[model samples]
Target chain A: TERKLLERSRRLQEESKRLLDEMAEIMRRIKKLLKKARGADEKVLDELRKIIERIRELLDRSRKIHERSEEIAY
Target chain B: EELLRENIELAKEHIEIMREILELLQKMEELLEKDEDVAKTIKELLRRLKEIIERNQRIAKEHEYIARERS
Candidate 1:
């Protein structure tokens, strides 16, 4: 349902599980990022940006389940 | 003794409502368990399940949500 095809739908559920795990990881990383905010290793912010993007994409894909999708013809 | 009997009736009413909700949930599960799932059936069942679950939860939460209404 997320990737424009049925096979993608399989990953949608897996992605949901992954996103949850990643969210927890991100919260932990947020503390690390804050600690590193003063230093040369501010790359954590960039990684956080990518994580946020992935989370946004995951949420956007999840919302499609609520939309009027084509009838899954078998 | 009369209060006890009334409480028992309320308990029975709760169980009866739960039975109906569970029956609907079971029907929805059965529909979903098909090899080639029926979209219409699944959608309808999903709607029915959502409604029943929400209603059942609301009923269960009544006492918790409204202590004033208990009396």
Candidate 2:
């Protein structure tokens, strides 16, 4: 049982890492587009900023989960 | 053991949630074919997120060590 749990844990972590890397790539591209965006209106900027904030929030949650997992003693 | 079990499961689910959110953001970014000063801010955000994932990998490895020792 312990072995299986460990195996599953390893797989989960690897998959998570892969997904996060993909996310980072996508975010970078979006950042590039935003930088080159010509005369984007205030309303559009506002909406994009909101989306960026949402991503930040989600990333924060993931960090907290990893931190909490590390503190899993005994 | 039970606590460890629960933590592992929680972390697993947490990853799934993150993956879904990431996908949503991916789609938004694609749709919005569209900041200059904001470029620095976005870069910083991505950098921080990357750091978290790197730390997560280390933490997962630490758990693997603990599991090996326990078993």
Candidate 3:
């Protein structure tokens, strides 16, 4: 057994927040470039709409989980 | 068409990277198995990322529907 493992675990919380922010940024950039593909407009639009619905469900689940995590931390 | 194919091919390559990321996460999960807390955390990440990949990657393949419909 080694104590070094705890350092990695300790850093995980901070990295998690940073990772979430990076992925959020990725989503916006993905949308921007997808929009610029003028030839593929309506198709991408429909796909994005479906993805929006999927994202909403995932967001609601994430929010609930985060709330529980926060409460547990307190 | 050649234009759409190029864009989608680029996306396929990127998605391949995502798949590799998932694989590496699995490997990490194996490495951290001794510690339940860290392993559990990795498990949650695998769920989150696998969900994202599963939910999003479908668009790449199904984009063919647009070509089919237009033709």
- Show model 3 residue runs off by greater than 4 Å: A1-10, A56-60, B1-71
State the lDDT of candidate 1 residue by residue for B1-71, as single tens digits: 34334433443444344455445445534423431233443445345545544554444334222222222
Q: Which ten residues in a row have the lowest lDDT in candidate 1 chain B?
A: B62-71
For each candidate, give its TM-score against the true structure: 0.28, 0.51, 0.38
* Lowest lDDT 10-residue stretch of candidate 1 chain A: A65-74
Higher lDDT: candidate 1 or 2?
A: 2
Whose TM-score is higher: candidate 2's or candidate 3's?
2
Model 1 interface root-mean-square deviation? 22.7
Clashing pairs in 3: none
Place model 2 in a CAPRI quality band. Answer: incorrect
What is the fraction of true interface contacts found in candidate 3? Answer: 0.00
Name model 1 segments beyond 4 Å from true. A1-74, B1-5, B35-38, B61-71
How far in Å is the alpha carbon of B6 misplaced in model 1? Answer: 1.2
Residue-by-residue lDDT tens digits, candidate 2, A1-74: 66666566555555655655666565656656665765566566667767766775676676566556545531
Compared with the true structure, the alpha-carbon lDDT of candidate 2 equals: 0.58
DockQ of 3: 0.02
Give candidate 2 misplaced runs (Cα > 4 Å): A70-74, B5-9, B12-16, B19-71
Per-residue error (Å), model 1, residue A72: 50
The most accurate candidate by TM-score is: 2
Instruction: Put down candidate 2 lDDT per residue, B22-69, tens digits, no spaces.
Output: 465554544354555555555555556555555555555555455544
